[model samples]
Target: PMTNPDSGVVVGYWHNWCDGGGYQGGNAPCVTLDEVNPMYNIVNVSFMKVYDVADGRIPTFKLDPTIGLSEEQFIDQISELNKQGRSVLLALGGADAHVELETGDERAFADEIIRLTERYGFDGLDIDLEQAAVTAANNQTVIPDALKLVKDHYRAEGKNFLITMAPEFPYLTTGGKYVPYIDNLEGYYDWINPQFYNQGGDGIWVDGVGWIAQNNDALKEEFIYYISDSLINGTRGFHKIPHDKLVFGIPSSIDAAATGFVQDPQDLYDAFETLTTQGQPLRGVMTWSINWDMGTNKNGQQYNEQFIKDYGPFVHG
Candidate 1:
């Protein structure tokens, strides 16, 4: 299992496509690794996969050339951050990517991931498997097995490897999709930041009957706390994840989510405070992408800047 400091953790996903003029439309400014907050314990490189090839036996991934930074620059920046005790990981798959491994190709997939980790000098890998990939039987078997292989390999080599997952909220709830994967792989995963937004205003069950809807105009503190609690001890038959291994995944800006994005940092702070005080202290918070956080939201506030100001001290405390 992954061990973290007593101090809470904060994670951020940095999108490579956003370095150029992709994802967010227009020619937005590029954000370099040096510009990221030093307080972020882990910066997951948003996406680094093409597609599955060779009858889904092998996965292909390449760094975006237009990300306004060379491969060597990324390596050097990550190296510097490692010296400072921060981790940088390569995230495979995204909202659109369908990267998955076949039943018999788990070892080959693990080899490819190991190759990338070595080449980019990444400390670990983040599984952002979405869409059909998340529900695939092969994925349930291949992903965790491959990650275990990588972790064991690194252990034998006298190195440490971290593994994290970003699953949509529905995938984690009772009778939800991908529960089997969680059941099988929970021990191998260090942390899981489930996307709590974009549920189309759907309600998540807090207790047996207490349901909380995901809405920006509502009491976000209740929503956040209940979700954290539910993830810890909600469903009777579902596996209970440790509170320290759970992180609230929210969008940095309203535009980063379709609905259910919190607009006020204080609301988030309050929710986090409640969780911690109730003995369900979360690991930390994770934003969708640092690129979106850098831009001005509809309220004209820099999302990430306000986030750091409001919640950074609490997380690092």
Candidate 2:
């Protein structure tokens, strides 16, 4: 496989104002600077927003600059890490962020965040705002507007502010999943990274290849072909999404299997390699969370070192 400096690099995304400061586990705070600074050589850092909506609650925000260091602190950290050849970014939204841009105070809140990014030394932003309420029928509109503002403002300033989103899998929705947002996405985002982890009990995994081949009826349809076709044909399909602006994500954590593909990371990689080999426009890949794959001492005794040893060296060559 041809390698780039950033191929398959590990991205450590920390939630700000987390339980205390680190990833939440046994009520543990997110990893502090002291613990993280050393890993700059091993990974890139993307500091996520200070709330986890996925946990089923609105994030509590306290804009007190004094309580925690301001975005300037993040900038300094980025600079420090950059000197070591590592990159840093700000990730917007969390499990707790439900259509933040769509809600009334979201615009103002988003503007403040953009301002913070300007003040910080981040190279980009990841909009992983998966709305709990967003479905094919009801995705909020303010999403595009808020994102447009960030994209346009950053582009105008001539900064390489990577604007990426963590969208639900293409197969997850039935109708026009993200079509309403695509018009606003054109030329606005640096990339769209799809979460290819779960498929919600769709028995396509067992007989996936067979069913897809039957569906295509061309006799040469592999699972990869079906995926590519579906993506290109879906409502929020990547058909119109430029090749340069795509990042296909693969999960590192083990979620209770809703369908096929339960715990095999190699299988996941196989699928990705198949896509890339077939000429799918993919800029990068993102893991779900750090704590799960890496295995924190506090979190557990497992370490997916093989994951790093397997793909890491080959990816960024």
Candidate 3:
């Protein structure tokens, strides 16, 4: 059975497709659901897509054959992880996904979501619809509205279906670009894991300290703390998320993105430690992907592994 989420979720994305030397020309690994690390209690199985725009844009998901797991084996793996206290979710869209829904597709979109949720035994859905995908739908309620339908379906079954979002950190502001997405999903969603990576090395402004670069050691910790705290407290303008319902999303390693790779592991831990003590424990940290954490990058560095060791334990508060 899918467990009702509380907090302190070590959320990580499982790359359904093989990296295959695409990321920095080094081969990242792929694994079936059960093979993901135990630390990643909330595993977002990366991407359900329309696959083709010509196909009427009905969302569909297919097990990547390159992973060498048949559909049956993959379904069993989801059950295995559920038994182990991990919530496996069907994440929708990615940097390359094609899950755009036209105006009259909300019901069908939700139907597909329900079908996938029951067919694969996913705990719920993770809204990773990035900038282009979200904008293409013109910040409408197609996805969020359909997601509510999916949640309502499960609610009728005496079960809770999770709805989490992973928008970029910049996209979540009071008058920001992606506020409408969150506006429609205010109460229906479970958590918001705003990505801190791929932001062109951007950082936040603190009242006392001014602007701090996120790549620095000690300053980066403050960035995570203040940005997170600001979001929770609503002191800063932008979209506000509950302290217990927001996770600090970051890249696991240097090669995880073009920029915004964290420098120190201790900073990562200190940020969590500081935030958790300040309020109720923060929901926890979310890396970009579990697959990125698995093997060495092109430079032979293991930043994700270091992140797991340094900050993983402290997140539970």
Candidate 4:
């Protein structure tokens, strides 16, 4: 099957609580789905959570009550995007969302995911598990098991479902706790967009040298080389993951992150060009957010728009 359209995949995360970063008129953080660019083949909705019932919580999926259009408007706008051949995925978990699933509740959790997919017409789901949730002892088992159940349920109905993950570099590299989860879900995932940014100067991991600290003034090409090697061949146990299933996750602009942000579009384009020549024809790119990119205009062009125009052709080629 085609992993993405011929234009290649340009995945962007859209926070339901953000309203185009006030670029759409008001300073409020509420954005409708229609405002997103069509160039993005897949847009992972920021988050939907199912709290640990054991800790007095319930499974729920709702737009942030304080921002954007109403839930009904969200559904309508996303439905239109779906018909336009764009994949809208519900992302589970975020920096602040603490979600957990017990072994016995895997199927029930999967069922809720399926219900949400059907209710909102989501193409699939993206796992953004991080922080305490990633370290939870049951995470490796519960997360993959529930995902498999969801995949199976969709398959039985002859529907196409996609499962993608956004894991931070540390958890997969130096920390190395997410290997087991990735191993268990081998053929089940569509892609892995590892967050390569925000690691400060100590995140570079070369193949033979292991993780090393770099100078703060390192160039974008330098960052790309380390990240590419780490995901493609540097990680001790995860080298088996094919390069094509990996997409480089970077910040859209300096404002999107306090550190590890790429400041030049030319540098981004050059990095993709370099990676392609190195036999790692990566899937594409994913930015921290479309909202943040839209919020700032760089050189008279929207950052996201400029990024797509500058690097999209090279990536798709």
Candidate 5:
């Protein structure tokens, strides 16, 4: 149970890859002993594996083991964080890393992943496999198969593993004539956190809550929030993801503002609260990357206390 059982501020974060060019004052900072054991309900560390590229398809790059924390170091970090009631997850893909594990002998690959999970002591895994069309015509269907393998094996091993997917917003998919194999893997996954950002018009971060409500029939009552939104507009028109199984994706760093989006931390907080109220089904909130947020400047401003204030309370167990 969480301290705020009614609502939560789960922070889903990634490092390195998602962190833009000027990360950590242009010097990648290592996670300190104290920082490693975070208080957030869930902290997602990313890019855990390297894959082979095929047919001009780029394999998801692995974290440079030499740069910051090695796999062993990260595993230890998760162990310590868990003691404080923080759940750690390894996010497998993002916009940059086009890793696809849903096709082929994905089940065998899942078994290998399970072994790695056991060694790491992580609470679970987040499969953010992006759009299937980009990878293959049949990639979408194959995703569920791989997830099923991982889910079954983890259960057999008696580990508390969570299988999540980063799907594109429902409306966009349907409009683009893309069939979300959501129904196929609903049973296999613990929850689904769609990448609610970067949808519809360019530079306009889509409201995930509204998207889920309109599309997914399995949405629970109280677990969802806005995964991404334009900072200038703030929380005005944003919709929430369901609260029970939903996780909001926040932007730790922003690219150059081309469409009137401002980088205001206060606005981000407002967006979070607004979406939470809008979608009574909201489960939690997640940041894009901790490394970038901890590193970069937003419109010439540094770390603002309000962002942490809005973020801090949810970590309690």
Candidate 6:
């Protein structure tokens, strides 16, 4: 069982897009990394896009042109956040999900990972590769081997390194193939924050309650417990990620996701209370984004902050 690097953490994915009209214009505005809610201690910068997938040669990442910060300024902002003891991870995999490594590219990919890390001073890596890409052939070993190399390099320098993954919750439940990523990582990965929202009709099948839908609040409390319990206790044919290494990632608001959004803070708080009491406590909470959490999205609300405000203390306990 791996432990959390902090007393408690609220992981927030900070999107890289920016627009002059901002979230109301249906685009997330970019800001300096440190200019987020202080509560978002672990900022996983959204997407290190794979430049090309078909060619199979290593592709690089690019920031949206609308984002005003230069690379040097971005690096400085990351340093500011790091100085405040917050971690900024360079997340791989956007919607296209380029985790597919051609065989024998592991060493080269590791070098690229280290080069990116060294260039930006990113604290670590977050694998946000989704469905097909995650299940892609050889990625289970190739990705982990590259990450292991990266981790070894940083560890040798006496610097703390973190490795985390985000998958849609269903991918980790019942005969889910993401199990191998966990298995092949060989306990080297730190935690798993499976996104528990935007999944239509996919959720835990509690014994007594039967199937609990993740698409809505119907049996919401049970959904959180049943799936988390399965992940931690190694039930439901899911792999074990342990309590402290398992963070539940949810959408920040109604605008933030297609479904599985809790409008009432107390309802989620109660669920949080029950989940911790029923089993070992979780590492903390994670949300889909910081922009939406800050009430800057097109249909913005402060649900994420409210969760951190109420449930974060409970998590820290």
Give all candidates' CA lDDT scores: 0.72, 0.46, 0.78, 0.70, 0.48, 0.74
| Cα lDDT of model 1 by residue, 193-257, tens digit | 77888776665654555667887356677778777776787553435668888888887655566
Best by lDDT: 3
lDDT of 3 by residue, 181-276 (tens): 788888788888888877765667777788866655557788888788778887677568888888888877665665666787677677777876
Using TM-score, give the best candidate's number.
3
List ranges where model 6 is wrong by over 4 Å.
1-4, 19-27, 52-56, 295-317
lDDT of 4 by residue, 1-317 (tens): 11224445788888877544332232223456798777777888988775454543224577776764777887887788877788898888886566766567677778888888878888888888766788664667887888899888877887768888887776775447778668878888988887877767655655654554422444667666666766777454434456778888876666566565666666667777777788887788887776775665434444545555555565655
Residue 191 shift from truth in candidate 3, angstroms: 0.7
Model 4 earns a TM-score of 0.84
Error of 6 at 208 (Å): 1.8
Better of 3 and 5 by TM-score: 3
How many steric overlaps are in each model, in order?
0, 11, 4, 4, 26, 0
lDDT of 2 by residue, 1-317 (tens): 10112433444454454332122332323444334533323232333444555643222233324325555565566566666656555665555444333345445544755766556555555655554534411234665666677666666766555566666565233444555556556676656665554553221232434443212223322433344435644422344454445544544433211222224445435655666676763444455544334444335545443344444443444
RMSD of each: 3.2, 7.2, 2.0, 4.2, 7.8, 3.4
- Candidate 1 displacement at residue 161 in angstroms: 1.0
Give me the runs in candidate 4 sitting further than 4 Å from their true place.
1-7, 19-28, 51-59, 205-217, 234-239, 296-317
Off by over 4 Å in 1: 1-6, 19-29, 51-57, 206-209, 234-238, 297-304
Quick one: RMSD of model 3?
2.0
Q: Which pairs clash inside model 6?
A: none
Candidate numbers, best TM-score first, in rank order: 3, 6, 1, 4, 5, 2
- Candidate 1 deviation (Cα RMSD): 3.2
Candidate 4 pairs with clashing backbones: 19-29, 19-30, 19-31, 30-68
lDDT of 1 at 120: 75
